[PDB]
Design an enzyme around this catalytic site. Structure first.
Site, short mmCIF file in Angstrom:
data_model
loop_
_atom_site.label_atom_id
_atom_site.label_comp_id
_atom_site.label_asym_id
_atom_site.label_seq_id
_atom_site.Cartn_x
_atom_site.Cartn_y
_atom_site.Cartn_z
N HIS A 176 0.82 -1.22 0.00
CA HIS A 176 0.00 0.00 0.00
C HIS A 176 0.86 1.28 0.00
CE1 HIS A 176 0.24 -0.48 4.47
NE2 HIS A 176 0.34 0.83 4.41
N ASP A 185 0.04 -7.62 0.63
CA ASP A 185 0.50 -6.29 1.05
C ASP A 185 2.02 -6.21 1.11
OD1 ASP A 185 0.61 -3.59 1.63
OD2 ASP A 185 -0.69 -3.67 3.42
N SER A 227 3.76 1.63 8.74
CA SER A 227 3.49 0.73 7.59
C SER A 227 4.80 0.28 6.94
CB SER A 227 2.66 1.46 6.52
OG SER A 227 1.30 1.28 6.70
N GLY A 244 2.71 5.73 9.85
CA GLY A 244 4.14 5.91 9.59
C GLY A 244 4.87 4.58 9.77
N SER A 281 1.24 -4.14 7.90
CA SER A 281 0.22 -3.74 6.96
C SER A 281 -0.78 -2.74 7.57
CB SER A 281 -0.52 -4.96 6.39
OG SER A 281 -1.65 -4.59 5.63
#
Lengths: 51, 185
Positions: free
Chosen positions: B33, B63, B141, B139, B156
């Protein structure tokens, strides 16, 4: 930003800050909209970016 | 630069997952993402230090994404913060794990379920995710989930926060290593 589709059970965690009417910087739109729902519609958007 | 450090795209900030390689080509893994719609990646908010360019992106459904380093001088540590990573492994229920991210730093917890489905809405559904009781915040991720010297997954999403506690879902790193034919080092 439109929060009508919330709440959502989970959010992705990228950082793209929004500033809420509570002076809190929300990390992203999903986090902000979930908080709007949690406040029963009392929280609103101040501006885009950090507070 | 190492696992958990900040990475900036044109759109926002995420965290570097793991530094990986194929032959003599170096890349880094992060969340799909984050790589979705991103081309160039920088090491700082000022966008003065280039890292590389997105080479692959898989989200939703999965992801994970991969970025090819174009910066020749920057150190590419095979660690997470200072912690050496020497192999990749499959998550198991009850496994003690640790996550490092650019916003919250390092937090620990356990794997509480496997093969979880996470619906981020608008048709963004991801499958086969690892569920844990580790918190994460915007932040974080793409940051690594590891256990000792073993690479386990990539951050994720989830809910809650680090103050009150939360639930975070991770993409199994093995699937990403396999998809790109790369390995940790």
């Amino acid at each position: 930003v439109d929060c009508s589709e919330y709440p959502k059970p989970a959010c992705t965690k990228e950082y793209r800050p929004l500033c809420g009417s509570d002076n809190k910087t929300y990390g992203n739109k999903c986090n902000f909209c979930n908080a709007v729902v949690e406040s029963n519609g009392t929280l609103t958007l101040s501006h885009f970016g950090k507070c | 630069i190492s696992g958990g450090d900040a990475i900036y795209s044109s759109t926002g900030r995420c965290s570097l997952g793991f530094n990986v390689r194929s032959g003599s080509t170096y890349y880094f893994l992060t969340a799909g993402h984050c790589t979705d719609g991103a081309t160039t990646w920088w090491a700082n908010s000022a966008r003065t230090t280039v890292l590389g360019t997105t080479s692959g992106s898989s989200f939703p459904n999965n992801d994970y994404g991969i970025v090819r380093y174009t910066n020749t001088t920057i150190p590419k540590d095979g660690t997470v913060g200072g912690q050496d990573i020497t192999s990749a492994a499959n998550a198991t229920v009850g496994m003690a794990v640790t996550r490092r991210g650019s916003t919250t730093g390092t937090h620990s917890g356990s794997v509480t379920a496997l093969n979880a489905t996470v619906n981020y809405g608008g048709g963004d559904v991801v499958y086969g995710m690892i569920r844990t009781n580790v918190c994460a915040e915007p932040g974080d991720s793409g940051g690594p989930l590891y256990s000792g010297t073993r690479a386990i997954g990539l951050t994720s999403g989830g809910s809650g926060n680090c103050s009150s506690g939360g639930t975070t879902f991770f993409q199994p790193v093995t699937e990403a290593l396999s998809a790109y034919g790369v390995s940790v080092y």
